[PDB]
Design a protein around this ligand. Structure first.
Ligand code: D9O
Length: 359
């Protein structure tokens, strides 16, 4: 039915299981679908937050998704454009008057979504003496007192800061907090059953944590240094991340639940970066690739097995979602790990797409 070589599932399971046996992976889980129907899904290993003993990693285990939160923020911004409350070419200074100054006055909402606003990767918590970084009025003022790294449309520079600003813009346009809007108009509207900005207490023991810092953050009521959780901070499960990726592949709809129009998703999924722009990530330059309206179009094509047009997004954790529209294929995974290793996060993509068969 799904037209998938099941020998690659054994290769995928054996790949994750070997890393868990060698000690460079506590747990691992994945979920893949053809035509909107999951045909393979497995969870491996156990986890501990360093203060307990191991408990079984399951397919419905809740875990922080990190940068995947940016995809929720992107959907929320585009929902407000559909309503006529925002425009992508709006200068940020129109919404946040603290941006009406040299440098910041040229930043538009489009720049924030595409990481071309010239912002640094992140803001400083050390130089913020006596500043409440979780307070929105002070975090913005401290931001505009920091010089910009580039001018607008000068380079693709991945920035946690850009999407915190988007979360503030959402808050100022809708009259409610960023977390309230996303919860109402995305989480409950798409029907996500195990997705929370703050896990209820009856579910905290069901959250996969691999460090004490993750246990500490699980009990926290706010982000430790941001006025919102628009760049990171969402807890979710495989099934919910799969639904979000399927919503994009179906161009805004998931059966009876609709989050966006199909023309809006088509805009989100086409390359929005000017040609020739240099790409940077954490100060280090990376290979140039397509990037949409908060959605990554790289890696795809070239020497990768994913078809051109495959959209994706990764998150520190690690986790990721990859959907191939040409193959009607979607793959999401949880690989909880503290350090990054391409053999543990990127290599399984070769194993999965090598199993895709015709039809
Ligand atoms: C291709 C690229 C992913 C490749 C990452 C490679 C790093 C290489 C060497 C490094 O030295 C090893 C890593 O520890 C350094 C990684 C830095 C990335 C941090 C995150 O920032 C976030 O907001 C995470 C949110 C959160 O933690 O709550 C970024 C999250 C996803 C990135 C997506 C993307 O842009 O795709």
């Amino acid at each position: 039915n799904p037209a998938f070589d099941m020998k690659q599932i054994n290769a995928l399971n054996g790949h994750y299981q070997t890393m868990i046996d060698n000690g460079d992976l506590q747990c691992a889980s994945y979920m893949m679908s053809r035509g909107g129907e999951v045909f393979a899904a497995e969870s491996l290993g156990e986890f501990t937050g360093g203060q307990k003993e191991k408990q079984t990693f399951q397919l419905d285990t809740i875990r922080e998704i990190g940068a995947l939160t940016k995809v929720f923020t992107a959907v929320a911004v585009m929902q407000l454009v559909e309503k006529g409350l925002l425009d992508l070419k709006m200068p940020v200074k129109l919404i946040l008057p603290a941006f009406d100054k040299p440098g910041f006055g040229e930043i538009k909402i489009l720049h924030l979504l595409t990481h071309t606003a010239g912002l640094s990767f992140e803001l400083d918590i050390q130089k913020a003496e006596g500043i409440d970084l979780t307070n929105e009025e002070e975090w913005i003022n401290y931001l505009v007192s920091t010089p910009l790294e580039y001018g607008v449309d000068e380079a693709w520079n991945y920035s946690r800061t850009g999407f915190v600003i988007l979360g503030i813009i959402i808050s100022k346009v809708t009259g409610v907090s960023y977390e309230q809007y996303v919860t109402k108009h995305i989480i409950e509207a798409l029907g996500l059953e195990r997705t929370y900005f703050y896990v209820p207490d009856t579910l905290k023991e069901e959250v996969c944590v691999i460090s004490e810092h993750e246990c500490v953050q699980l009990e926290k009521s706010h982000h430790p240094y941001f006025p919102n959780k628009a760049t990171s901070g969402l807890y979710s499960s495989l099934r919910d991340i799969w639904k979000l990726a399927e919503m994009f592949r179906n161009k805004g709809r998931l059966k009876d639940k609709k989050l966006l129009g199909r023309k809006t998703v088509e805009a989100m999924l086409r390359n929005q970066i000017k040609p020739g722009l240099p790409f940077y990530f954490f100060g280090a330059p990376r290979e140039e690739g397509g990037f949409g309206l908060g959605i990554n179009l790289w890696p795809a094509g070239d020497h990768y097995f994913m078809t051109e047009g495959t959209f994706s997004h990764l998150g520190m954790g690690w986790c990721g979602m990859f959907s191939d529209p040409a193959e009607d294929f979607t793959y999401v995974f949880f690989t909880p790990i503290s350090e990054f290793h391409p053999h543990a996060v990127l290599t399984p993509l070769n194993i999965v797409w090598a199993g895709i068969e015709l039809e």
